[PDB]
Design a protein around this nucleic acid. Structure first.
Lengths: 348, 489, 478, 494, 186
RNA sequence: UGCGAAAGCAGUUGAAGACAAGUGCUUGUCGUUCGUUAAAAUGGCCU
């Protein structure tokens, strides 16, 4: 059953998120309403909904703290110069509007991600909010304090970024910011070492890049429930305006500094606006919001598109958001008509 | 810089001081973030929580020179909005109470102490308390007739205090001073914000009347003259804020202060008038005219004197026929309708002027029959119908030069339903050598309306600054330790 | 539909066990029903195909017995949050229904087989198939003391079965649809209801005859009965709860519900009831407040009227108030700023509320209140003209002239010079009339204040004059 | 923390004759149009219905003026002699006009070509033609026969009723609003006669004696009527048969009255009175018929009218003068693809459980002096105080705020002769007024204390000091004169 | 017929009597950070951080021990110097609702900030000779005290390692360090 | 500082010790004591 068929939305579904440990799906869009649904597959009811007056939702993510599992938040942002955090533990809603000297580099909060950072002075893990800004800037803030921790600048027009984790020891890990501009040059920063650059490389082929996304390990889409569950990501995907997706195997791609992709996918002909991986990384879901029914599922490591699905009668619509379930093997596709359709992969 | 603190990981510095602005310095990029216009100067900063998600500040309100007014403020880190703010009562005592020292600043001001000034000022205040004849630490507090809320005038603002919850309802500025616009530093600390010296409620509780003095800055032609402003405020019982309806600038003439305010009985215009008296010997009557939708000066008694005295008290009969005006040693009875002196056609056994031994401090009309007059020496009861003094008591060994003029009305209050009187007497505890020490003791005596018998006699271990009658059978008193007690049935 | 698949109160009704689907896996939760904390602990079924078919509480350690569709019957200890033991029937057929009486545990298989297990020895004591009993889905145990001798099963028609003979003693005509509820309300009567049927049949277990038929307004989901068989509660598909008060004691053939209970929120949304509980003078109802959160209420069903609606508070269009904020949205620690707004500013000296002559035009302008003719008269500046005009003016109009001149002098400061000769001539000529008239400050209130401001400004002007004298004399000598 | 307080403008104690809200309402009738007619405009009437046009009677012509454009849209010129009164029905479909030949001609309201009815009411001139307000079938005509006649519109061959008992020249009549049986006639002998039409009607049921010849009668309520004649107007109660009030505010005879209530205004009811001295005045029936506003015109005002309560557009006050003038014063009254992309913004959250509102509302823009005082730029704020076109109250507020912070010397530091002259040029005007004089004295004296040495060098500063000296001497003389007159007032009052 | 009583009054107690310390705040957040414990001159007030209401007030007048220590009429020098979360004397206990109060003259009081007060709270005294304890430090189950004394208006500091003897049922101090002529300390 | 209306009316800041600087001498300073009632480190306020 469709996820939001019980309580319809009044706009395109700009963002979808699954709770890390609960059967909850959060939808957000330009109608300024965050809607949380309990996902049964057969009833799919509405847990709650919150309307933020004057604040459209471009991106909204569930966050669950790695230290305390009772600390649960919803982080929400649109074109505005602020950001909202809803404490899910009357609603407790804080606003992050202060950038501690860097408002010139951050004019909007719409493109953000939430990650885990180990401070390594006390080996304590806290969440960080990474905001894309102008002039290649990414501003990284504490998720509770809202203080400006650090900032990483790449050259050229920054188009996307993502978070990778690398385990160092027992109970220790490092966080890497992977940022890509429109040319194809990719920077990798070590957030533990004051945000200094680990490495820089170039996307082979590489023009008009819109999306970058790691997969096969702990991602921002699928986080860890404890520090020992943190794994590195096997796959990296880069998606371009032309409809091309270059797919890199990280185990061989970290060495070259001009790596070769395992595959280059041209099944879609419009701009790649959604890249997602399964929690195991066996499926890469690539999608475009420019035309109708532009969603493809790619089997890895064979790098081959599935043939029987999707179908000429599949009601995908103009796919604006994609979410994978952490455990259930569900796929939620939110489109421009406000519908979030739900499917189950029977293998998972 | 009065307060310094670090974050836990040490990348940020919290600093605060006389500017009432809290600064967070990024120690990497040397850029700071401000939270300005706090309620007081920052004497303490702390970062709290495992992730530093709280800021705990201690803020002192240095506009009050009499006491150390601390506010404890816990701030949410993300919003920089107050999770909690904790006060006590904020009364402005007439003089500085024991062991209260002004904080250190760059230079010696009225609000602050310099580096050199602190050690001398502690000694000077201590030996002032030991040696000086005058010990006045009295405040004026109001009780709202509707809410039973205690109103403390705090210099240029008013604090509203919920008595039963022991908490604060509101804090509202009432003057046009510099106030919360900026934090005064260096020579700016010598500026004086306008002082609310009187506040009263109409019997209905719909109107609040505030009298204030605006002080000019130094080194000008206009540095000598003082502005006196009388303001009338209203509010609905739903909202908490008061709204300024009427403002009168120099209400008794230019540079003539108002000594006494007395709201009218219910019979006089549904308790929507007041009666203001100045030190030249003049009365004025103000009343709410609905057609003008404002307060209007309705009656005037001209001063017409070269006699200047701050010992002014008023009383008003419950039917509103008579006004008892005590000015210096004289006490007059005035008919309200003519607003002139009372004259009788028979002119037999009816004297409207009373000449007394010393200056009147309080006039209290208990019922229509009994009139208490407190002088600098004696406390007398006069029966108006009889024209005879019932009994007089000697207050001279207690109230000899201790209080300034018109400050015993803070100490004497009266019950209106049952007619009982409360009187409070403060005594300094003396050492075995004979030198009067710091410590004090207070006695509360509850008298009958005729002052014939003492219904109650209580001792309290601390100086009592203000006793007032709660509007149902209770007497609320305020210590100098900011505690509040009740002497009631 | 309903997110809760299966639910059951314990005996004494203090706790509720329910089954809900989380993504693709079922889970079992237990919530206390009395108001006087949430239970976050859940029993997750790891296999996606594995489902709970039936459930039954156990009256040392409280436990719930859960039949599965693989053919296993799990005894789940609620405190340890674990399945202590899993009974198996040996066949992969789903467990249609279960019942317990003391140490015995009886269950019916999907292939119409009977299995008796025992709890303490943890063994399958026996299994058997009885002829003419097929497609069975309800089993209950007829209480004949501590010893168990009779089972009551139902496919669509109810059979009474003696255990040691393994044969059907008595058969009852049930329902056209499969039997959904089968309970033993007392030891001579039992009750049966079916899927999609509003009717309940009460049968005598010895006579085999139908005593009565109880009818609900809608199709019946769940049934509860008090211990004395003096009240029966049913929750129906529409979400209401119907109470049949004293159904056994006796128009006699079919009975209608005595009381009806609904739950309506404040905004008007109907809230369905699943799984009520009834006892002596107490009734407990349950409903889902959020998507999958059970909430309970206790009622005294004897005191309530025949049609009762419970009003519960739900968040519909709630304005998200904050403890730290006020109603306006400002901080509570923040002080209220000083604002004048539209306040009238006044002073204390306002004592309101306390040939060739032009006297003809002046009088006409004063009577008509005519500004243009008054200006035409006031344009004349000859002292003889002014004096004789005011002399010929009536005494009453002089007061009006003084008022108008006071207003013009106050509003226009440059006319204070020329208009003062009119004012002074009025005061000189009409002085005696002004003495005779009373309330002179109230009538001439504008004139008094206009003169007061100018007269009050004098010492500052003199001081500034002296300073400017110093400076001018100094640079003049220099 | 606390939001910063806005700087409060200095408001001095108020002066006499402040702006009344009724004046603020009535002075919005600002745009004026004067149309010259061939003869005196005797009657002005408004259409009771939409679009609320107004009919104007001149010699031998009735003109319908549009309310939207204030231009004439219809013209009735069929009348052989001078036409006197023109009026509309309550529904606004018919227009009745009275002629000097005794004719009453009833036309369609917007069709001057078609004449539905023509009544030979009298041989004497018919000065009044009115339609019954309650009944659409009745036309009341008053002529110089001293007889008023009620006609049915259907059969107009004979008068349905004739009302007599007037000794001279009935030239006004009115209908009481609640009672459709009552008719009031006002005549030049001074008696307002009330007739009950259900009775005989030859004699009035009672009469009300307005001593001067009654020019006009109007009914402002079911109980109260207002009659004007002579210099005054009198408002009477009908049940008590006694006058409640009389206002003689005029020089010459009051010619016309109008009444309008529930129109969008501070004042709920208004009575408009026009006289021969060129004055049209507004009176408030709730406030004891006191005087609120007035207009003066170029000549004797025969007629006046105000647009009705339900105007729902421009509002007019119209006056018709004896000279032939008519004066009107008025109060004025992305593609589909992109939209489906961005459609969600106009939601407001009706179906949602919780609504959270912390959105920041825009405020009024801070002025430059306020910004500089906020940013602690005292010299820049002093420079921004004196700029051409800036209000004198605001130039006072900057000085008072700087004085209050104590920044007089700080703002005055570092000034040369060129930067000192705007302050002194404003102080030249600031000495004269009473509100600013003390502040000007403070600032000028601080200027003299700081910069007294540069006077000996700079010549222009010496000229400014001498000019301000002369102004100060003039103000001292004015203050002394005011103190002398105050002493004279004390002698007279005492 | 008339009875005096002290009902409602507030003055937050500050650790400013020492006047040499940098951190003057005694109020402490609880472990779950839902309650804020603030000393007053007449009581101890617990606030709910989430609801901004005073949940529980431990008034000195209601308890005999608290009135015996703080409200002594002879000496007003008694003031709460430190509040420590949990119970110091009992190890290995959660002690969610218990706090430990250290006064300047060495009294140690164990109180409940939730629920009704115990009629006889756990009360002890630290053996201090001619000293006023200015502060108390906790770290990983180890405790120290910093005490001011006088042997110039400047005072001097002694740092004692503090232990609790379960058998002796008392607090014991060992002289770890000493400093003289301390102007300021953070 | 004391009293007094706001105006005013009377009254007053002494020692000691230590240190610094200049050159035993001179001067200043005081997180010193005792006695009397007695300016200035380019440093300005959030979203």
């Amino acid at each position: 059953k469709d996820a939001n068929a019980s309580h319809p939305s009044h706009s395109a579904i700009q963002s979808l998120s699954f709770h890390p440990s609960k059967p909850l799906l959060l939808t957000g869009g330009y109608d300024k309403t965050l809607r949380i649904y309990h996902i049964d597959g057969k009833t799919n009811h509405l847990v709650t909904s919150l309307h933020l007056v004057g604040s459209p939702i471009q991106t909204c993510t569930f966050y669950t703290s790695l230290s305390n599992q009772n600390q649960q938040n919803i982080f929400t942002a649109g074109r505005r110069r602020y950001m909202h955090s809803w404490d899910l533990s009357t609603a407790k809603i804080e606003k992050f509007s202060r950038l501690y000297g860097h408002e010139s580099t951050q004019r909007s909060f719409e493109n953000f991600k939430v990650a885990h950072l180990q401070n390594s002075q006390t080996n304590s893990v806290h969440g960080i909010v990474l905001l894309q800004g102008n002039n290649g800037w990414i501003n990284i803030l504490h998720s509770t304090s809202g203080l400006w921790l650090m900032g990483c600048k790449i050259e050229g027009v920054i188009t996307d970024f993502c978070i990778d984790y690398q385990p160092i020891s027992r109970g220790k890990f490092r966080t890497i910011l992977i940022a890509v501009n429109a040319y194809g040059e990719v920077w990798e920063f070590d957030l533990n070492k004051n945000g200094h650059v680990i490495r820089r490389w170039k996307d082979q082929g590489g023009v008009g890049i819109t999306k970058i996304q790691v997969g096969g390990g702990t991602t921002t889409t699928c986080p860890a429930l404890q520090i020992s569950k943190i794994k590195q990501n096997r796959w990296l995907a880069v998606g371009s305006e032309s409809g091309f997706v270059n797919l890199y195997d990280r185990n061989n791609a970290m060495t070259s500094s001009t790596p070769t992709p395992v595959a280059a996918l041209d099944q879609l002909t419009t701009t790649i606006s959604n890249l997602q991986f399964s929690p195991d990384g066996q499926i890469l879901c690539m999608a475009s919001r420019a035309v109708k029914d532009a969603l493809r599922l790619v089997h890895l490591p064979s790098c081959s598109v599935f043939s029987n699905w999707p179908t000429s009668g599949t009601p995908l619509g103009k796919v604006t958001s994609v979410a994978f379930s952490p455990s259930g093997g569900l796929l939620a596709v939110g489109n421009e008509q406000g519908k979030v359709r739900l499917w189950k992969l029977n293998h998972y | 810089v009065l307060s310094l603190s670090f974050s836990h990981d040490g990348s940020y510095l919290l600093s605060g001081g006389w500017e009432k602005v809290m600064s967070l310095w990024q120690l990497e990029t040397n850029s700071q973030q401000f939270l300005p216009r706090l309620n007081g100067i920052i004497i303490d900063c702390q970062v709290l929580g495992p992730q530093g998600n709280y800021y705990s500040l201690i803020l002192q309100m240095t506009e009050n020179n009499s006491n150390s007014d601390y506010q404890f403020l816990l701030l949410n880190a993300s919003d920089l909005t107050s999770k909690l703010s904790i006060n006590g009562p904020l009364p402005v005592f007439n003089s500085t109470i024991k062991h209260i020292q002004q904080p250190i600043s760059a230079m010696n001001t009225k609000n602050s102490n310099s580096i050199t000034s602190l050690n001398h000022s502690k000694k000077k205040q201590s030996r002032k308390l030991i040696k000086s004849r005058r010990q006045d630490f009295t405040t004026n507090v109001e009780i709202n007739p509707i809410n039973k809320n205690l109103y403390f005038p705090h210099i240029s603002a008013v604090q509203i205090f919920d008595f039963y919850k022991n908490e604060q309802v509101n804090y509202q500025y009432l003057t046009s001073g510099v106030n919360n616009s900026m934090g005064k530093v260096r020579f700016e600390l010598n500026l004086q914000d306008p002082i609310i010296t009187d506040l009263k409620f109409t019997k209905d509780g719909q109107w609040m009347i505030t009298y204030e003095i605006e002080y000019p800055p130094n080194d000008l032609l206009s540095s000598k003259d003082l502005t006196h402003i009388l303001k009338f405020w209203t509010k609905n019982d739903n909202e908490t804020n008061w709204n300024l309806k009427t403002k009168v600038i120099n209400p008794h003439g230019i540079s003539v202060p108002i000594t006494k305010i007395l709201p009218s009985p219910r019979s006089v215009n549904n308790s929507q008038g007041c009666l203001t008296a100045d030190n030249n010997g003049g009365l004025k009557f103000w009343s709410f005219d609905s057609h003008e939708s404002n307060w209007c000066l309705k009656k005037i008694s001209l001063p017409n004197f070269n006699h200047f005295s701050n010992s002014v008290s008023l009383a008003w009969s419950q039917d509103g026929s008579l006004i008892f005006h005590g000015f210096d040693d004289k006490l007059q009875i005035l008919d309200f309708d003519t607003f002139k002196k009372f004259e009788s056609l028979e002119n037999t056994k009816t004297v409207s002027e009373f000449t007394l031994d010393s200056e009147i401090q309080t006039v209290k009309l208990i019922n229509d029959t009994n009139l208490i007059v407190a002088t600098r020496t004696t406390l007398n009861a006069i029966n108006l119908l009889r024209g005879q003094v019932i009994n007089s008591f000697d207050l001279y060994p207690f109230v000899n030069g201790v209080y300034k003029n018109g400050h015993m009305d803070r100490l004497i209050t009266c019950d209106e339903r049952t007619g009982n009187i409360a009187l409070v007497i403060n005594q300094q505890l003396t050492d075995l050598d004979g030198v009067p020490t710091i410590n004090y003791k207070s006695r509360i005596i509850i008298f009958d309306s005729d002052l014939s018998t003492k219904l109650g006699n209580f001792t309290h271990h601390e100086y009592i600054s203000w006793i007032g009658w709660n509007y149902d059978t209770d007497f609320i008193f305020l210590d100098i330790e900011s505690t509040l007690g009740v002497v009631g049935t | 539909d309903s997110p809760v698949l299966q639910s059951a109160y314990d005996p004494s009704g203090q706790y509720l066990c329910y089954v809900t689907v989380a993504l693709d896996k079922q889970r079992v939760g237990v919530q206390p029903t009395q108001r006087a904390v949430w239970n976050e602990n859940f029993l997750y079924l790891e296999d996606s195909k594995l489902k709970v078919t039936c459930l039954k509480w156990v009256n040392d350690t409280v436990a719930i017995i859960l039949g599965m569709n693989n053919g296993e019957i799990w005894l789940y200890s609620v405190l340890a949050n674990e399945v202590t033991y899993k009974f198996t029937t040996g066949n992969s057929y789903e467990i249609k229904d279960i019942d317990l009486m003391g140490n015995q545990l009886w269950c019916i298989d999907s292939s119409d087989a009977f299995y008796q297990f025992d709890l303490l020895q943890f063994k399958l004591l026996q299994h058997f198939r009885i002829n003419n009993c097929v497609q069975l889905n309800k089993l209950t145990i007829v209480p004949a003391g501590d010893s168990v001798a009779q089972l009551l099963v139902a496919s669509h028609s109810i059979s009474l079965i003696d255990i040691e003979e393994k044969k059907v003693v008595m058969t009852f005509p049930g329902h056209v649809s499969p039997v959904s509820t089968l309970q033993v309300i007392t030891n001579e009567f039992f009750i049966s209801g079916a899927e999609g049927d509003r009717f309940l049949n009460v049968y005598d277990i010895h006579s085999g005859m139908t005593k009565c038929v109880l009818v609900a307004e809608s199709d019946i989901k769940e049934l509860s009965h008090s211990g004395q068989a003096d009240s029966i509660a049913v929750t129906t598909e529409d979400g209401s709860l119907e109470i049949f008060v004293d159904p056994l004691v006796s128009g006699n053939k079919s009975k209608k519900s005595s009381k009806k209970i609904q739950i309506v929120s404040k905004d008007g949304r109907k809230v369905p009831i699943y799984n009520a509980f009834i006892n002596k003078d107490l009734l407990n109802v349950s409903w889902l407040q959020n998507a999958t959160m059970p909430y309970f209420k206790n009622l005294q069903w004897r005191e309530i009227p025949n049609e009762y609606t419970v009003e519960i508070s739900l968040n519909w269009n709630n304005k998200n108030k904050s403890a730290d904020r006020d109603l306006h949205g400002k901080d509570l620690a923040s002080a209220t700023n000083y604002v004048e707004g539209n306040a009238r500013v006044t002073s204390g000296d306002n004592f309101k509320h306390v040939t060739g002559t032009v006297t003809v035009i002046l009088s006409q302008a004063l009577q008509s209140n005519d500004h243009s003719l008054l200006e035409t008269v006031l344009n004349n500046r000859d002292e003889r003209v002014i004096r004789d005009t005011i002399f010929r003016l009536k005494p009453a109009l002089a007061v009006i002239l003084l008022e108008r001149l006071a207003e013009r002098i106050a509003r226009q400061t440059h006319r204070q010079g020329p208009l003062n000769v009119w004012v002074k001539w009025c005061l000189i000529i009409h002085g005696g009339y002004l003495v005779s008239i009373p309330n002179l400050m109230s009538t001439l209130s504008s004139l008094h204040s206009t003169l007061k401001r100018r007269s009050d400004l004098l010492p500052r002007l003199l001081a500034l004059d002296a300073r400017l004298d110093c400076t001018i004399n100094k640079f003049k000598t220099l | 923390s606390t939001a910063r307080p806005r700087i409060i403008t200095s408001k001095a104690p108020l002066l006499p004759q402040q702006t009344t809200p009724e004046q603020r309402y009535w002075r919005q009738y600002t745009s004026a149009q004067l149309v010259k007619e061939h003869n005196s405009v005797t009657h002005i009437s408004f259409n009771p219905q939409h679009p609320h046009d107004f009919a104007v009677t001149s010699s031998t012509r009735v003109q319908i003026f549009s309310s939207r454009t204030r231009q004439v849209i219809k013209t009735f010129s069929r009348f052989k002699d001078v036409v006197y009164s023109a009026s509309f029905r309550s529904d606004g479909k018919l227009l009745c006009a009275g002629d000097a030949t005794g004719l009453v001609s009833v036309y369609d309201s917007y069709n001057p070509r078609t004449i539905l009815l023509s009544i030979n009411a009298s041989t004497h001139p018919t000065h009044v033609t009115k339609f019954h307000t309650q009944d659409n079938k009745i036309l009341a005509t008053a002529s110089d026969d001293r007889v008023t006649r009620l006609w049915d519109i259907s059969n107009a061959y004979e008068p349905q009723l004739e009302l007599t008992g007037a000794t001279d020249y009935v030239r006004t009549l009115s209908f009481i609003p609640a009672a459709p049986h009552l008719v009031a006639t006002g005549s030049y002998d001074g008696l307002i006669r009330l007739y009950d039409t259900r009775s005989s009607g030859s004699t009035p049921i009672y009469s009300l004696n307005h001593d001067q010849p009654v020019e006009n009668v109007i009914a402002v309520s079911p109980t109260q009527i207002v009659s004007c004649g002579g210099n005054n107007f009198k408002v009477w109660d009908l049940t008590s048969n006694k006058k409640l009030y009389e206002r003689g505010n005029f020089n010459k005879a009051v010619t016309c009255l109008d009444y309008v209530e529930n129109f969008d205004s501070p004042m709920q009811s208004a009575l408009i009175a026009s006289s021969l001295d060129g004055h049209v005045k507004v009176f408030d029936p709730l406030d004891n018929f006191q005087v609120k506003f007035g207009w003066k015109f170029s000549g004797p005002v025969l007629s006046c009218a105000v647009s009705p309560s339900t105007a729902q557009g421009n509002r007019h006050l119209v006056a018709g003068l004896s000279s032939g003038l008519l004066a009107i014063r008025t109060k004025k009254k992305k593609s589909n693809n992109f939209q489906r992309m961005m459609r969600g913004s106009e939601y407001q959250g009706d179906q949602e459980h919780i609504i959270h509102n912390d959105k920041v509302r825009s405020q009024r823009r801070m002025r430059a002096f306020e910004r500089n005082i906020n940013q602690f730029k005292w010299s820049e704020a002093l420079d921004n105080a004196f700029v051409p076109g800036m209000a004198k109250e605001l130039t006072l507020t900057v000085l008072q705020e700087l004085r209050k912070r104590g920044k007089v010397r700080v703002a005055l530091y570092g000034r040369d002769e060129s930067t000192l002259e705007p302050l002194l040029n404003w102080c030249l005007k600031g000495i004269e007024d009473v509100r600013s004089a003390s502040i000007v004295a403070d600032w000028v004296a601080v200027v003299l204390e700081l910069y007294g040495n540069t006077l000996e060098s700079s010549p222009v500063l010496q000229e400014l000091m001498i000019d301000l000296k002369t102004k100060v001497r003039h103000e001292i003389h004015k203050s002394k004169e005011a103190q002398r007159i105050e002493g004279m007032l004390q002698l007279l009052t005492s | 017929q008339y009875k005096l009583s002290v009902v409602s009054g507030g003055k937050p107690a500050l650790n400013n009597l020492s006047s040499v310390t940098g951190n003057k705040n005694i109020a402490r957040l609880s472990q779950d950070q839902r309650n804020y414990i603030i000393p007053f001159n007449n009581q101890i007030k617990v606030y709910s951080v989430e609801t901004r209401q005073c949940v529980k007030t431990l008034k000195f007048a209601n308890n005999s021990l608290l009135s015996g220590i703080f409200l002594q009429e002879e000496e007003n020098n008694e003031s709460i110097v430190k509040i420590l979360l949990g119970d110091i004397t009992v190890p290995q206990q959660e002690d969610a609702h218990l706090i430990t109060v250290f006064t300047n003259n060495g009294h140690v009081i164990v109180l409940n900030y939730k629920g009704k007060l115990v009629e006889s709270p756990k009360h002890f005294k630290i053996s201090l000779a001619d000293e006023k304890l200015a502060n108390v430090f906790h770290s990983e189950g180890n405790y120290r005290i910093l005490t001011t004394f006088k042997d110039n208006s400047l005072q001097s500091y002694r740092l004692y390692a503090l232990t609790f003897d379960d058998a002796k049922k008392q607090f014991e101090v060992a002289h770890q360090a000493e400093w003289h002529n301390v102007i300021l300390s953070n």
